[PDB]
């Protein structure tokens, strides 16, 4: 069992920033991908960033350039860099594993303009 916690969010003007983060607890060596994602009202959750084990990643193209995903290894943690936000951006934003399956809570995000 892997524990996710996302913390963050906020509420931001266009052109302003934010940084979620996603700490894992338990036996995070089995996970070898971690995955940003964020939901509007009426539509599906999808994909924001992911990052694998090495450190490469791949973005949604609405973000791509915007947003950073990164991550800290010796803490075990997964940063979502929110920069450069529009009001698309507004949404709340979860952090999953490779696994698919159990989301966290999540957290909100805001933009307005
Ligand atoms: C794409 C992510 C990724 O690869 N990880 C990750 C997972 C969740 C959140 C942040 C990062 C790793 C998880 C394992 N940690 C080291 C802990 C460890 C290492 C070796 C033996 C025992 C324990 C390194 C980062």
């Known amino acids: 069992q892997v524990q996710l916690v996302e913390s963050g969010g906020g509420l931001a003007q266009a052109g302003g920033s934010l940084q979620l983060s996603c700490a894992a607890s338990?036996?995070?060596?089995?996970?070898?991908?971690m995955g940003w994602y964020r939901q509007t009202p009426g539509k599906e959750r999808e994909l924001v960033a992911a990052?694998?084990?090495?450190?490469?990643?791949v973005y949604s193209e609405s973000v791509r350039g915007r947003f950073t995903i990164s991550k800290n290894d010796a803490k075990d943690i997964v940063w979502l860099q929110m920069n450069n936000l529009t009001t698309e951006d507004t949404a709340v934003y979860y952090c999953?594993?490779?696994?698919?399956?159990?989301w966290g809570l999540g957290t909100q995000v805001t933009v307005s303009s």
């Open positions: 999953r594993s490779g696994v698919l399956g159990s």
């Open positions: 338990g036996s995070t060596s089995r996970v070898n991908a």
């Open positions: 990052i694998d084990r090495s450190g490469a990643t």
